[PDB]
């Protein structure tokens, strides 16, 4: 496959402008399904996918309470990291965390993840074996020890091997309609002259799900890696993605050029070219 | 489903 579930937490301190803000979002694959923002009037976990709406009262209370408790704990964590690094009370800092699971055969965990970053740099990660940690530096080693002392890896492992993987299949069942249907890219090559000598060839891939794609320009079956402009895969907002690969070519030589599209929804890879 | 709170206090960084 593989299907996955990921929760993305962002804790941001803001001295003088209030207590740290906590944001959590939930993804199954490339589809967001929940959000929580501590900045709301009465912060409540909110549904962000149709298939999650069905869940009963308990799901909302549970999610809200986890996130509200994590908010408080993230304020505390932010104060700790400030101290580990002997940081000013005035500066604004961010702890980020991504954790989740990759769905293997028989619905068992294929891969577990738990990673944290301080101000955009790797801080502490749970290892592939799910029992150990890799601390990026000396400050993260203080965290490592707090966690080893509290047997956190075992607690986190229980969740990844169990609850996480169970709840991912469920969501996948409830939303099989969209989560289990891969939308292939709708593709075309455009031509835009640049001068009498040169022209831009743009390979478009539109409306695909999930985001993983490879767009490759090939001159005579040779990768144009060096001079191919590639845009970051971008969301169309309808839950699908868009991407284009562009290359400047000599005028009248356009036929030497070929576009290669690799996508999950595509049974076989696509070999694309400009057809005026 | 997010990770559930442990029975005790949540461990910080």
């Amino acid at each position, epitope marked *: 496959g593989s299907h996955s579930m990921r929760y993305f937490y962002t804790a941001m301190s803001r001295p003088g402008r209030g207590e740290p803000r906590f944001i959590a979002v939930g993804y199954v694959d490339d589809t967001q399904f929940v959000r929580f923002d501590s900045d709301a009037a009465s912060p409540r976990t909110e549904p962000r996918a149709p298939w999650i709406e*069905q*869940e*009963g*009262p*308990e*799901y909302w*209370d*549970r*999610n*809200t*309470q*986890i996130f509200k*408790t994590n908010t408080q704990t993230y304020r505390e964590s932010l104060r700790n990291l400030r101290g580990y690094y002997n940081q000013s009370e005035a500066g604004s800092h961010i702890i980020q965390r991504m954790y989740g699971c990759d769905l293997g055969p028989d*619905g068992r965990l294929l891969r577990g993840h738990d990673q944290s970053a301080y101000d955009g740099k790797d801080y502490i990660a749970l290892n592939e074996d799910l029992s150990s940690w890799t601390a990026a530096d000396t400050a993260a080693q203080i965290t490592q020890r707090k966690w080893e002392a509290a047997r956190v890896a075992e607690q986190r492992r229980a969740y990844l*091997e*169990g*609850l996480c*993987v*169970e709840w991912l299949r*469920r969501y996948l*069942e409830n939303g099989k309609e969209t989560l289990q249907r891969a939308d292939p890219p709708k593709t075309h090559v455009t031509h835009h002259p640049v001068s009498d000598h040169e022209a831009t060839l743009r390979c478009w891939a539109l409306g695909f799900y999930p985001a993983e794609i490879t767009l490759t320009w090939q001159r005579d079956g040779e990768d144009q890696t060096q001079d191919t402009e590639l845009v970051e895969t971008r969301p169309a907002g309808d839950r699908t993605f868009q991407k284009w690969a562009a290359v400047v070519v000599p005028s009248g030589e356009e036929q030497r050029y070929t576009c290669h599209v690799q996508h999950e929804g595509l049974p076989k890879p696509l070999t694309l070219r400009w057809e005026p | 489903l*997010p990770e*559930p*709170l*442990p*029975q005790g206090q949540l461990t910080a960084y």
Partner: antibody
Amino acid sequence: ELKVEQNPLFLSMQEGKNYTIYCNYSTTSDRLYWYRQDPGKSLESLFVLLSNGAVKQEGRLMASLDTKARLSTLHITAAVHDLSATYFCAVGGGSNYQLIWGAGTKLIIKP
Amino acid sequence: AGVTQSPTHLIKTRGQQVTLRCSPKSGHDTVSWYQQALGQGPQFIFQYYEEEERQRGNFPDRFSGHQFPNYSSELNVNALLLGDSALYLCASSRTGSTYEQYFGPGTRLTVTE
């Protein structure tokens, strides 16, 4: 829709021997519990099984969860008279607060 | 402290009213109410969380509940019917936690002619 059926309704057993009681449920489980009730008393918690392949052992009791078969089993090992009670099974589904309960399995451990 | 319930028992007649009290285990914030009839499995009345009735079972309006800001609860049952005789049980749990749910000792209601 979420239906919970336990079996047998009652079990006659010899002390020292091993026995298995069953809990079948119809729809996706969020939580599966095992409770113990003594005559004229309330419900004592024993186990909560949350995901497929969960196995929990507390003393002479062991509870397992098979979400594929939508079955939970309670194993009573080296049965002792003191284990005599009604053993219940409760299941929660659809992230609802409402737990559906089985009719119970009365355990009669004979000396 | 563990899950507590009051009163121990009630002996009523039809058309009467009762209130029953439950206090969750220290650390628990949500409370469950169940009716248990002779030789029967418990039946869900309601769950209270954040002073609100979160969900209800197959029970009429004469079954009314309350949750206080200290997480303690009340189950009021008016226009009592002979069928209302049961063991009224309360269970509590800590929201977003490990899924434990503990029961109180129960209040034994008897509705007699």
